[PDB]
Write a protein that binds this ligand. Sequence first.
Ligand code: CL
Ligand code: CL
Ligand code: CL
Length: 241
Amino acid sequence: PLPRKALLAITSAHPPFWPDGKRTGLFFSEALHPFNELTAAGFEVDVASETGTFGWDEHSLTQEYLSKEDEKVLHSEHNHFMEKMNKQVFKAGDLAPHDYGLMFVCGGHGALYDFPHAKHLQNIAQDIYKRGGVIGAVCHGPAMLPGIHDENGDSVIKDKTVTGFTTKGEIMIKVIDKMREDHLHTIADMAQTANAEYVPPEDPWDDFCKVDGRIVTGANPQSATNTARDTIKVYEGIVNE
Ligand SMILES: [Cl-]
Ligand SMILES: [Cl-]
Ligand SMILES: [Cl-]
């Protein structure tokens, strides 16, 4: 039986990144919204990064990217989400992978730096998938997926339809130059190299999710809630087999 316990995977990278000089990192709403959905569906949640540490993407902490509810959580000390983020983030390699029935992979541009080679997080996900569980991933989160393998050593997304942050969006927000400077690949190029089929939303910020078997992906911060919801729907079907 797949445990009703989720691993919320977060980037450990937070370098200066944006054109105004601000750091990237974990996208705030992309951790909070899935945490809320998982909690509402009765999951226990552990948070982990490859190192055990993280920083928030600085743009994700601005009004442009925070709802009224988001900001209240951010500035609240006693809140269960913030207590977990402040005091309970694990180094991924310490955790026993068999404890989880689902992984949810958060985004933020930091994910481009560490997720492709985040072998401890990838090991947890491979184990979940092998036991028949579910992996959801939003925005830049899908950068982890090429390194999560099936029994044959192929990516779990081989021949699957996936979405994720558009190359159009990287150009529009003017981070494509920095990505090339740091030798980062776009989500679409990572998906193609893994032999997946990348599908962008009609416009770069549309709520847009793809479900293909037990791999669920979302395109951007506006897709996070529904990516988590779709991931939970897939899980519920498996445990009711
Ligand atoms: Cl910079
Ligand atoms: Cl535990
Ligand atoms: Cl694109």
